[PDB]
Design a protein around this ligand. Structure first.
Ligand SMILES: CCCCCCCC/C=C\CCCCCCCC(=O)OC[C@H](O)CO
Ligand SMILES: CCCCCCCC/C=C\CCCCCCCC(=O)OC[C@H](O)CO
Ligand SMILES: *C/C=C(C)/C=C/C=C(C)/C=C/C1=C(C)CCCC1(C)C
Ligand SMILES: CCCCCCCC/C=C\CCCCCCCC(=O)O
Ligand SMILES: CCCCCCCC/C=C\CCCCCCCC(=O)O
Ligand SMILES: CCCCCCCC/C=C\CCCCCCCC(=O)O
Ligand SMILES: [Cl-]
Length: 264
């Protein structure tokens, strides 16, 4: 897991290494700060959409803990020796991001289906296919990055299979969105279309980070990847769940929930 990542191949200057450390530690604070926000606003959401904000809190801590885990792992693996930080232990890898995405993604998808006003049969059915599509995407992608050092061709093939799931997954998402936005209240039929494009953008940054070993195999590619992961995390989880929350509140107010109508 550790020796399989391009991180293990390079020494890092002080500036590259502190900069990565600060991207992770910052990612933690952003998520734990948003957790408090999502927490305080749960009271202004009608019982119908209130699980959607709870799922945001679950994401913020799930990501926060894996990011904080990367941060520490980052500093335990390297030591400043002779003017550069040099690998000292086999503790750091991006594999724990992948096993994290197995959890956060179903939560990010569920809160979408919730604000879309699905329920019962369709909610359980659409939920099942998306998580299996997402899990297929994640698993094929995890196996592929195990070769980002040894067999790039393999990374390309698994990346290809992973993208097949990704494409099927977004097609289902978009289909349910455009077929059910006429149901949403307070004018959120316009917001949800924006959230979808936000999904398409932020999520597409991930495969771009996945391919960094293929076009930038050096220490500055290790920095660019984390920088890309940071931008994707902040957009796919924080900004994403902020608009999920806005949508939830808006419809709560439009549906006659008083705490929502007074919050707004
Ligand atoms: C074998 C090699 C692996 C490749 C797997 C590729 C596609 C599997 C998905 C195809 C089956 C998808 C049909 C179910 C579905 O998509 O349901 C969507 C609907 O909108 C919800 O209600
Ligand atoms: C190795 C790469 C293999 C993959 C090659 C890519 C080919 C497919 C391209 C884009 C699909 C995008 C799907 C997501 C777009 C959402 C569109 C949508 O939501 O569905 C339309 C809806 O039915 C309207 O009513
Ligand atoms: C908060 C984290 C999120 C929403 C992670 C999303 C991850 C992806 C959309 C990953 C997609 C990949 C492919 C489409 C092919 C290459 C391998 C992956 C797993 C990086
Ligand atoms: C809730 C209000 C507070 C917002 C969240 C604040 C986050 C608190 C501290 C995060 C500490 C993370 C620093 C890890 C350092 C490890 C390292 O340097 O590698
Ligand atoms: C393949 C693994 C299974 C994945 C499917 C997970 C199913 C998720 C289904 C819906 C969970 C959200 C329930 C929220 C309903 C709100 C209604 C209420 O609580 O009164
Ligand atoms: C869905 C299940 C995955 C579908 C097919 C993945 C096959 C990719 C195997 C890569 C071969 C690499 C190798 O063994 O040298
Ligand atoms: Cl995550």
């Amino acid at each position: 897991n550790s020796m399989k990542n391009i991180e293990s191949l390079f020494d890092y200057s002080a500036g590259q290494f502190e900069f990565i450390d600060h991207l992770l530690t910052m990612g933690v604070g952003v998520h734990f700060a948003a957790l408090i926000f999502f927490l305080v606003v749960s009271q202004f959401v009608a019982p119908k959409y209130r699980i959607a904000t709870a799922l945001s809190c679950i994401v913020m801590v799930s990501a926060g803990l894996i990011l904080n885990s990367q941060a520490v792992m980052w500093t335990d693996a390297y030591a400043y020796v002779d003017g550069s930080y040099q690998l000292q232990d086999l503790t750091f890898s991006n594999g724990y991001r992948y096993v994290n995405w197995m959890a956060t993604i179903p939560c990010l998808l569920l809160q979408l289906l919730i604000v879309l006003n699905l329920k019962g049969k369709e909610l359980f059915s659409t939920a099942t296919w998306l998580i299996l599509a997402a899990w297929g995407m994640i698993i094929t992608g995890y196996v592929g990055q195990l070769y980002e050092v040894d067999d790039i061709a393999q990374l390309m093939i698994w990346g290809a299979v992973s993208t097949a799931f990704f494409v099927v997954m977004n097609w289902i998402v978009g289909t349910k969105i455009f077929k059910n936005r006429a149901t949403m209240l307070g004018g959120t039929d316009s917001t949800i279309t924006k959230v979808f494009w936000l999904m398409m953008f932020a999520w597409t940054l991930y495969p771009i980070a996945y391919l960094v070993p293929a076009f930038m195999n050096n220490a500055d590619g290790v920095v660019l990847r984390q920088l890309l992961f940071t931008i994707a995390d902040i957009s796919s989880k924080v900004i994403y769940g902020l608009m999920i929350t806005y949508i939830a509140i808006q419809q709560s107010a439009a549906a006659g929930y008083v705490p929502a109508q007074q919050a707004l």
